[PDB]
Symmetry: C5
Subunit: 365 residues, 5 copies
């Protein structure tokens, strides 16, 4: 992803105008390839018209150019672009929201699963690894970079994400479906086995551990559904045709004709079209937005970095469930033990943020 | 459904332009039937005007053509198309979201319902079959392909989805309503009977099993409501009339008139209209999107495949609740037993995805 | 309601064009009354202008007609229509979603309230009737057809929905408010009395029965709030004025003037306006959509049928809680007892729906 | 509020046209003040131009009028109006949805808190009063009419909403913040004290009573946040400027110039502008909608009536928790004791609402 | 933030027009910097054209000006502005909704954690401080003013937010990630340690305390995700280019040319452009709205005041959990002990708000 939040915190003289000099993940980078084709076609057509064509052919070309220019009536490109982009953006954000974070579950596991010794450490670590395995499987199934990192199920064993016995057990199912649901069943069985013992005190703490697992499974299923079902090809093709016909009409129809015929509108000759390139930039970036965001799990610049959160999650959960089981700092009286109105100090650089409490809009009326 | 997600992962020189060569589920396939009628009518009218009509009739036709062309003012077809399509797309996605998956329930059943023997296997299998029966009934009642697969309730018995005794009991209700609610009551009664015994330990694990059933019933009811109540016929007819009047006006009014009368706009004669066919394609695909998505459970190409998930669900649930009751892989120390900072390896092809953790936008200011 | 879902399952040559021949709940039925007034006014004005007016008055009328036609600039009727209709449609669907169905509650009552004898049957039936009484009261208070069916509270006693003692107890409250909240309090008291006894085993099954009642009460309150608070009259009047001024300007300003004055645009005389009637149809159906959907509980064709679900609910709940308390079919081994990969058969007519499971978008890259 | 729902139940010949004769809460009432200023300015400018100005000044005025009229190009007033009004309407409805109703809580209190005597009646009444006190405090802090009714905290004591001891305890906190959170803490403490005794049976019924309190607190906090944070002044000022510049340009630029100069468009002189007043009405009502709905808690006509629900809630809750503790009507066999298919009768006036049950869209294909 | 809610409670003659005189947080304040550049460029270009250029160069400039003015066709600036601003506003409100308030948690802690003595006071205070520490950490990581107030983790110790032992324990983790998740694990461990003792009665009151912590963690994670992932740079750059090209075209193309050439449209010379400055104001404020709201945690005027709620929360929670453990006012009979229909009095200034209860729309039909 690209983070420019620290650059637009305040509104200044140049805030949105200094972002036009960026190169990574920008319209210039996305359209360098397709601007050259447009320029080459435009100049080839202009040269052919101005050198090869004779007088009668030039007259025919001028008549065709007027006929073509009559059809740039702003066909609802400005409508389909925007009615399509809003849906694309909504789908993009909804796809982000269904990323599984085992933070609501590592806390519960570490707090509830008792026993500071072996056979308790092993149980907690296995329980927390079974949750990461499912997210790894679904992310590998839906993400190109994660698939490149783990092309085969043996790479998961080699990387320590799962054991040889687990791989052998997974291979012995004999089902022609994605096996991204097995770790949740393993988690449920292990939790019940742990309850049948001295490691879980009550059944009220066991119906709370098997309630975050259901939510994680639902989120993984939503991710899989988003990957499986895509925006209709009919809608995508309609938008593409509407955008491309505009520039096809512009190519022959926005050319500087001869000014010796007193044509109504074509009066001066310019070497390059200045206000056509700007329209190209605008109307093509508006489409490149959707082109980039149609699949958030890829290798673009504005795409989710799913290879960082399979390691951050692993490290954080393993540290939380093992090294911080019941190791907490000492309890001491705080600074405001005898004061009912604490007043934390203010620094010199942040003294202008002092404000009085808001006491309702109806105060002093 | 049509899946092209793997083809649009990255933005390239041609990403949205190589999708115009697809045939299955595309505008060309959807409009091959209705393009011929338009072309035939256009050419018949042109031939009649240019051969049959005399001079006075030709003058009258020209005056009528100018009057007609004055009325292509972009009547808000570009508005109704889009204000209708957004609603259609929202309804389509909401219809998808209410598909029942018994994954949150098979886990709970397998974990909680105890007993690895007969009378435990039978109880678990019956409990998990009662949930699939209701989804099968509602899907058969709302889906054409599923109805074609199961035209009669005896086909369900023949296919193993339910037993002869269950069919006889269902036939003895005597109610003039859809019987898609009985299996949930059967599930509740069987769960209570199982609790009245040694197969469910506590009442906290029985109020958790009868809480996923309520959610599944709500989802089935939402599906039935979506099937029963449709988008208003008034709105559909308004959109259809608005779209059709546009091309009716185009037919007589976008014809190449005689250029001997110095008409203001009609100057050159072309054999075929190039910029009318493109408008037809765009404005008709924008309507075919809604025509396709108005009923997601059909036999189109971009329609839900409900015949695959009545078998995937059955196989997965039956395997999970029976063959994996408390069969889990052995517990062994993992690779990172003594390391507090695990570092999984990176492959050569995915070495460019290495990134540092994000530590807030306010860092280093 | 009008159901045409079975007619638009697939996209064919004529799918949206065969819906224009429907009469019930259509634009023709909704506008037959107001098309005649428009036609009569148009023809009366035309006859007056063409017969009564003299030469100077005709010249003045022509000047006024040009001035009027200059003001049909598509004032944002196409905007307010659509920005109003989207809100109306959202409110309509939200009003539908808050219809109370006692399916999540009849299951719990039948499963939990124990005792197959008298004083158990009576308790279950009273508990399930108290829930239907509240929905009947709110629906009668908000629906015209239901009020016509039950004009007085004595009709409820006559129809068996409540008892004479219940009516006498309800009459002795002395409050100037709608008494649609009493049955929920009665339900809570009866449930607590049943718990204080042998009919409810635990308090975990009593906090689950008094949690669906709260949701039903919330849904009824939302229905009452939707009935009480309506779309602002200012917004409705703005839309109505914007729509009506358009046709007021069209009446005088879209008339065929004399072609002897070489006017710029008026060249040919037609007996009837063809492209004005189509605009009338479109711009008036777009408003009749909101006119119909502004109150879903009425006597239109596209209005909710609330008189069917006060009887369906009653029959279904009474049968479920009484005749199916713990009567369930026998438990027998199913067809796939010894098979780990069930394969239900496919019919000849549905053999084209066979598909392979989707295994991720990243497969085979 | 204004309720016209009973007037628009069905679509008739005049349904939306008979609402234009209403005076209370209408565009005429909202714009009577500002129509006079516009008319006076228009006529003063016209009189000055037609009497005071000489020939050269008149020519200059005509040139300026053409220049001004060239700038009425429908600047996106039709866009900002509507993109602003949708947000305003959404905020209005969301503000309504967060009104606290203690109906989910009075039921639980009356059902669970046991003891029909003194020290039980007192406890229930105090528990139900602590909930109303917080809603009264927040509504007084955010609503002008409620503040006018209760200008001082002593008025609450005088009106019986709280006791002298409660007022003295509230005055002894010494915090410079709104004290709308204290009653919830008092409720929690009183509930725990009641549990530490014989009035609450289990801790499962105490975690259910302290779960509605959290929801009520969240709703009150949302109301306070909506009051505190408003729509940006930049956006409001942008909309106001865009609307006002339109009529500023209309004033000088939509005047009837002299027809002796053969100007292109100004041909006939009318005493009053007919199609300018209609545009004023439409474009000004579209803004008065947002002006009215920007603060739902005021003294307009289409504003929430918060002074009725501080009394309705009090009476209803006090009656429910005290006079109906365990007083319920007798249990008797209903009318359909021996009938499995109840058939309630239909009246003559509602005999046309009889319908058959819907059995799926796939039936009979 | 800027609060003007008390000024727009009612709709008056001037309600939205008296807000144009505000200076703080307004379009004038936001555009004073960039209006001068536009004016200077315009006047420099005008002076150069009218003094430096010769006759032929002036003719070329006039031809270029007509060519430029032909390209102000309202390129969809009015569309992108609004389709971008709606998304920005939605993100802004969603960012506000995820602010953690420990009001649902301080109530539960004070009510449930028993013991009015030392080792109970210490436990409650530590439990309530661990929750504030996490919100302080995330707010410091995402907010510029909070970072300025607390530039280093030692400032938190100096300000009393955490202890030296806690700082030393936090420093000994050795992870390259944001440590905003540790306090939640500490809270869970401390809660379990408290349960293992006499301070928590049941496990039903311990699964309720560790359920608000999960919600607070989810809200903090959502805030962090919103900070990390921003609106695409492609979309921002597209909007900026579309807005800037409009005024670039206006600069050369909206100038008063010589009126001696009878140009079609340029007839009168004005010293300053009046209707260009208004367009600048409108089209630039519409963009400054998004420029301001793109990062709600900054130092603008319409930005969240996060430095007030780290102190309000601290004071309120510390007072609630310590000084109000089980200190509640005495229980006495209220004013309406013997009255079933309480009637609170109405003041003279609020006597016009008396209304009758709404009894359904179907009443009296
Ligand atoms: Ca991508
Ligand atoms: Ca279909
Ligand atoms: Ca209706
Ligand atoms: Ca108001
Ligand atoms: Ca900011
Ligand atoms: Cl799922
Ligand atoms: Cl150009
Ligand atoms: Cl349902
Ligand atoms: Cl053509
Ligand atoms: Cl309610
Ligand atoms: Cl006509
Ligand atoms: Cl809050
Ligand atoms: Cl006028
Ligand atoms: Cl999170
Ligand atoms: Cl100007």
């Amino acid at each position: 992803t690209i983070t420019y939040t620290n650059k637009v915190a305040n509104a200044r003289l140049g805030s949105f105008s200094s972002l036009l000099l960026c190169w990574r993940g920008s319209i210039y980078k996305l359209l360098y390839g397709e601007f050259l084709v447009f320029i080459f076609l435009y100049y080839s057509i202009r040269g052919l018209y101005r050198m090869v064509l004779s007088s009668d052919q030039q007259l025919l070309f001028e008549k065709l150019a007027l006929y073509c220019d009559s059809y740039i009536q702003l066909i609802p490109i400005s409508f389909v672009l925007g009615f399509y982009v809003t849906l694309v953006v909504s789908r993009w954000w909804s796809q982000y929201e269904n990323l599984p974070w085992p933070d609501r579950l590592m806390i519960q596991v570490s707090s509830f699963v008792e026993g500071k010794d072996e056979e308790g450490r092993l149980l907690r670590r296995t329980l927390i690894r079974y949750a990461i395995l499912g997210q790894v499987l679904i992310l590998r199934s839906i993400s190109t970079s994660v698939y490149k990192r783990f092309p085969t199920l043996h790479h998961l064993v080699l990387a320590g994400f799962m054991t040889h016995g687990e791989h052998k057990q997974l291979q012995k199912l004999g089902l022609p479906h994605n096996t991204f649901w097995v770790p949740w069943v393993w988690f449920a069985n292990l939790s019940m086995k742990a309850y049948l013992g001295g490691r879980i005190r009550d059944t009220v703490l066991l119906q709370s551990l098997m309630n975050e697992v259901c939510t994680l499974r639902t989120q993984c299923g939503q991710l899989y559904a988003y990957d499986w079902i895509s925006i209709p090809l009919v809608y995508t093709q309609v938008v593409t045709v509407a955008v491309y016909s505009f520039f096809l009409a512009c190519l022959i129809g926005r050319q500087f004709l001869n000014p010796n015929k007193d044509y109504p509108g074509h009066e001066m000759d310019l070497v390059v079209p200045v206000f056509t390139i700007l329209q190209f930039l605008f109307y093509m970036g508006w489409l490149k937005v959707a082109e980039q965001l149609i699949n958030p799990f890829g290798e673009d610049d504005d795409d989710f970095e799913t290879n960082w959160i399979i390691d951050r999650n692993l490290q954080v959960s393993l540290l939380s469930v093992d090294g911080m089981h019941q190791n907490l700092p000492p309890m001491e009286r705080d600074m405001y033990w005898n004061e009912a109105a604490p007043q934390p100090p203010y620094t010199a650089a942040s003294a202008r943020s002092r404000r009085h409490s808001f006491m309702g809009s109806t105060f002093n009326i």
